[PDB]
């Protein structure tokens, strides 16, 4: 399992998503 | 070379037909001459005084005439036998194959060959059959002047005449074709989908190009002629054609182009987008002693009342043309069949390669194949129509998602897609395997699977490796600022609390600026 950090258009961190 | 071989073989057969009818013409001329001399000698026998030899000659001449009559008749029979074989090849093989290539072309496949080769072939066999019919009437004249018991002309005249007409009728009937399928000129890459109240165009062509036919054949357009679904299918819609229903065929090619045609509705197992209609075309050749009815139909058409329904209607055209080689399976969507991945993949690639200058590669298609068939994806896997356009494979259907991507590429990302900058269709796992072990500012462009609208996003790797992605960019964002400018001016806060552009290298290893410098507005 790995995670990707999500950033908005502005660049601000919006969270993370997890994949398998 | 396979195509060349077939072509050269047909060319040879057509030449044989032409040569054979010319030989007969020469033979018939000689036969008339022999008969005239035979007539002379029979009327002048009394004058000769030298009488016995002349009587012997007269009998020999009869024999020569009989033998020549038999020879000419035999040659005509053989010619008709060759003609039938040749025409069957032109009609049941070549033209059938051209019509199949036209189906593919309508749906984004490779371009259609021009009809002139088949026109030449159809016209030579037609001219030859016209000459034969003249040759049979000349033979009948000779028979009327002189006939005997067991005359070959008398014995074969009825069949030879019937055969020749049947062959000519079949060839001219088969030569009546839809050269360009119905299409709205405002939507040229979207054929066979017609919108009510809008202008559309269809072109007809007669492959037998005979000069006598110029300006003489009047083609009439009919909508839904002999369509049993208007009775058998509940809710079946009815339309009328506005505009001129008639056009004369003119020459070069003998053709009839219908411009300014229009459909208007008349005052539910099949949805509007799955309902299939037909345009039929009719004309008649009328000459003294010669009548032939000529008819042909377009490929099935979907009629829509709103432009919003165009992507769905297109999906139905794609399905039919990909899976069916018939012009009139109007009940196709009552029980729609499934497609193999191999056929669908080609067609999907065609969609991209028609709209843009670039199609889809094996990697992009393998990704899509998994979306439709799953990890077990094979080229022989079957995709139901319901999985392609109706069901939500997520909260949305697959073809609508693909379409909205192609409209984003057309309106906002053409040069990037054409130049190879966008990976586009890559699985999350695949993105992880390519991105990991790469340089700290490596990024890739791809389309969102979670967005119905059609969006684009970039994913970059960073050393803790950490992976990062941006919220997707739809058309609205793209209209305000171009995507190369977005890539150029993107900023994330660094650990030092200073804005920085994480986008350094386009995968595999290309400087952001080298790859996207051309497209920057500033």
Residue numbers in the entry:
A (entry chain C): 11 to 30
B (entry chain A): 133 to 181, 191 to 392, 398 to 413, 422 to 547, 550 to 620, 626 to 683
Sentences from the study reporting this entry:
Here, we report that a highly expressed poxvirus protein, 018, inhibits IFN-induced signaling by binding to the SH2 domain of STAT1, thereby preventing the association of STAT1 with an activated IFN receptor. IFNs bind their cognate receptors to activate receptor-associated kinases that phosphorylate receptor tails, creating a docking site for STAT SH2 domains.
Intrigued by this, we crystallized the STAT1 core (aa 132-684) complexed with the minimal 21-mer 018 peptide (Met11-Ser31). Crystals diffracted to 2.0 Å with 018 electron density clearly defined except for Ser31. The 018 peptide forms a β-hairpin with a β-turn midway through the sequence. The two peptide strands augment the central β-sheet of the SH2 domain, with the 018 Val14-His17 backbone hydrogen bonding to the βD strand of the SH2 domain. The 680 Å2 018-STAT1 interface is formed by multiple shallow contacts exclusively within the SH2 domain. 018 Trp12, Val14, and Ile16 form a continuous hydrophobic interface with STAT1 helix αA and strand βD. This is followed by the HxH motif, in which His17 forms an imidazole-to-imidazole hydrogen bond with His629 of STAT1. His19 occupies the same cleft as His444 of pIFNGR1, forming an identical π-stacking interaction with STAT1 Tyr634. Strikingly, 018 does not interact with the pTyr pocket. The only Tyr in the 018 peptide, Tyr29, hydrogen bonds with the ζ-amine of STAT1 Lys584 through its hydroxyl and makes van der Waals contacts with the alkyl chain of the same lysine.
